[PDB]
Design an enzyme around this catalytic site. Structure first.
Site, PDB file in Angstrom:
ATOM      1  CG  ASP A   1       9.351  16.537-102.815  1.00 23.21           C
ATOM      2  OD1 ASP A   1       9.032  15.658-101.994  1.00 23.21           O
ATOM      3  OD2 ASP A   1       8.530  17.408-103.216  1.00 23.21           O
ATOM      4  CB  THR A   2      11.279  11.029-100.956  1.00 23.72           C
ATOM      5  OG1 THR A   2      10.667  11.524 -99.761  1.00 23.72           O
ATOM      6  CG2 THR A   2      12.783  11.012-100.730  1.00 23.72           C
ATOM      7  N   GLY A   3       8.568  12.777-102.047  1.00 25.64           N
ATOM      8  CA  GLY A   3       7.114  12.705-102.289  1.00 25.64           C
ATOM      9  C   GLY A   3       6.735  13.192-103.659  1.00 25.64           C
TER      10      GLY A   3
HETATM   11  C1  LIG Z   1       5.684  20.643-103.295  1.00 23.31           C
HETATM   12  C2  LIG Z   1       6.357  20.457-101.921  1.00 23.31           C
HETATM   13  C3  LIG Z   1       7.249  21.688-101.603  1.00 23.31           C
HETATM   14  C4  LIG Z   1       5.303  20.383-100.815  1.00 23.31           C
HETATM   15  N1  LIG Z   1       4.439  19.230-100.910  1.00 23.31           N
HETATM   16  C5  LIG Z   1       5.062  17.952-100.771  1.00 23.31           C
HETATM   17  C6  LIG Z   1       5.284  17.226-102.088  1.00 23.31           C
HETATM   18  O1  LIG Z   1       6.174  16.121-101.903  1.00 23.31           O
HETATM   19  C7  LIG Z   1       4.019  16.675-102.720  1.00 23.31           C
HETATM   20  C8  LIG Z   1       3.401  15.464-102.002  1.00 23.31           C
HETATM   21  C9  LIG Z   1       2.110  15.058-102.747  1.00 23.31           C
HETATM   22  C10 LIG Z   1       2.075  13.806-103.358  1.00 23.31           C
HETATM   23  C11 LIG Z   1       0.947  13.367-104.042  1.00 23.31           C
HETATM   24  C12 LIG Z   1      -0.133  14.240-104.172  1.00 23.31           C
HETATM   25  C13 LIG Z   1      -0.123  15.478-103.559  1.00 23.31           C
HETATM   26  C14 LIG Z   1       1.011  15.896-102.853  1.00 23.31           C
HETATM   27  N2  LIG Z   1       4.383  16.295-104.087  1.00 23.31           N
HETATM   28  C15 LIG Z   1       3.966  16.884-105.204  1.00 23.31           C
HETATM   29  O2  LIG Z   1       3.165  17.863-105.240  1.00 23.31           O
HETATM   30  O3  LIG Z   1       4.507  16.302-106.288  1.00 23.31           O
HETATM   31  C16 LIG Z   1       4.048  16.722-107.562  1.00 23.31           C
HETATM   32  C17 LIG Z   1       5.213  16.616-108.559  1.00 23.31           C
HETATM   33  O4  LIG Z   1       5.287  15.195-108.790  1.00 23.31           O
HETATM   34  C18 LIG Z   1       3.963  14.650-108.772  1.00 23.31           C
HETATM   35  O5  LIG Z   1       3.961  13.448-107.997  1.00 23.31           O
HETATM   36  C19 LIG Z   1       3.178  13.669-106.822  1.00 23.31           C
HETATM   37  C20 LIG Z   1       2.241  14.835-107.158  1.00 23.31           C
HETATM   38  C21 LIG Z   1       3.068  15.686-108.106  1.00 23.31           C
HETATM   39  S1  LIG Z   1       2.928  19.456-100.346  1.00 23.31           S
HETATM   40  O6  LIG Z   1       2.234  18.149-100.462  1.00 23.31           O
HETATM   41  O7  LIG Z   1       2.223  20.509-101.064  1.00 23.31           O
HETATM   42  C22 LIG Z   1       2.958  19.868 -98.643  1.00 23.31           C
HETATM   43  C23 LIG Z   1       2.835  21.168 -98.181  1.00 23.31           C
HETATM   44  C24 LIG Z   1       2.861  21.469 -96.831  1.00 23.31           C
HETATM   45  C25 LIG Z   1       3.016  20.452 -95.891  1.00 23.31           C
HETATM   46  N3  LIG Z   1       3.046  20.645 -94.721  1.00 23.31           N
HETATM   47  C26 LIG Z   1       3.141  19.141 -96.340  1.00 23.31           C
HETATM   48  C27 LIG Z   1       3.109  18.883 -97.691  1.00 23.31           C
END
Ligand SMILES: CC(C)CN(C[C@@H](O)[C@H](Cc1ccccc1)NC(=O)O[C@H]1CO[C@H]2OCC[C@H]21)S(=O)(=O)c1ccc(N)cc1
Ligand SMILES: [Cl-]
Lengths: 99, 99
Positions: free
Chosen positions: B25-27
Site C-alpha cells: 500500500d503506497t498510500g
Molecule cells: C486501507 C486501504 C485498504 C484503503 N484505503 C487506502 C489507504 O492507502 C489509505 C489512504 C489514506 C491516506 C491518508 C489518509 C487517509 C487515507 N491509507 C491509510 O489509511 O493509511 C493509514 C496507515 O498509514 C497511515 O498513513 C496514511 C493514513 C494511515 S482507503 O483510503 O480507506 C480507501 C478505501 C476505498 C477506496 N475506494 C479508496 C481508498
C-alpha cells in the site's frame, strides 16, 4: 517515472480539467477526491477504509491526466482526508509496483 | 517482481514469526496488521484513514520477510479491515511505483 517511497507519492494531476494534487495509492481500489464538481450524473455510494465508511458521489467517465498520461474512469467525491488516485486509474496508465 | 494493479497487490509475508497476507500500500505511511502477537514493548497510537481513526499498538523493530527481502521496522497492530504493508517497509525492500 520511478517513484521511491521515502515520502508520500503525491503528484499533481488534472481531474476533469482541474489541477489537483493526489496520492498514488496502490491500496485504494477507487479514486477519491474531496470537493470537486465533475461532469455528468452522479450516483450515491458508500466506501470503507481503515476507520469506517464515508458517503461519496460516483461520477463515471471523468478524465484524469497524470504527467501526460490520459485515462477516463470513475471518480468518487466525498470527505476523504487526502485526495487519492486508486487502482482504477493506476492500471490505465500502466503503473506497477517493482522490487 | 513487477506487480500490475488489475487486482489488489496482496502478497504473502512473514511478520515476526507468523506467515500472513498483506496489501502492498503506497498510500499507507505505516504497516498495520490485525491480531498478531508481536514481541517487545509497545506504545498506544491512533491512526486515521477514510472513515476516521483506529487505536493501535505500536511495535518497533519487527522483522518482516517479503519474498526474500528482509526488513526491520515498525508494525502497528489494530482493527484494520485488511492487513497493509506501508511505505515504512516498502522503502526497506526497495519497492518503487513506476509508470
Ligand atoms: C486501507 C486501504 C485498504 C484503503 N484505503 C487506502 C489507504 O492507502 C489509505 C489512504 C489514506 C491516506 C491518508 C489518509 C487517509 C487515507 N491509507 C491509510 O489509511 O493509511 C493509514 C496507515 O498509514 C497511515 O498513513 C496514511 C493514513 C494511515 S482507503 O483510503 O480507506 C480507501 C478505501 C476505498 C477506496 N475506494 C479508496 C481508498
Ligand atoms: Cl493472513
Amino acid at each position: 517515472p520511478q517513484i521511491t517511497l521515502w515520502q508520500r507519492p503525491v503528484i499533481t494531476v488534472k481531474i476533469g480539467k482541474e489541477v489537483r494534487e493526489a496520492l498514488l495509492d496502490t491500496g485504494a481500489d477507487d479514486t477519491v477526491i474531496e470537493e470537486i464538481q465533475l461532469e455528468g450524473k452522479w450516483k450515491p455510494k458508500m466506501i470503507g477504509g481503515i476507520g469506517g465508511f464515508i458517503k461519496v458521489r460516483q461520477y463515471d467517465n471523468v478524465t484524469i491526466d497524470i504527467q501526460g498520461r490520459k485515462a477516463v474512469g470513475t471518480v468518487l467525491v466525498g470527505p476523504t482526508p487526502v485526495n487519492i488516485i486508486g487502482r482504477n486509474f493506476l492500471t490505465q496508465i500502466g503503473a506497477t509496483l517493482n522490487f
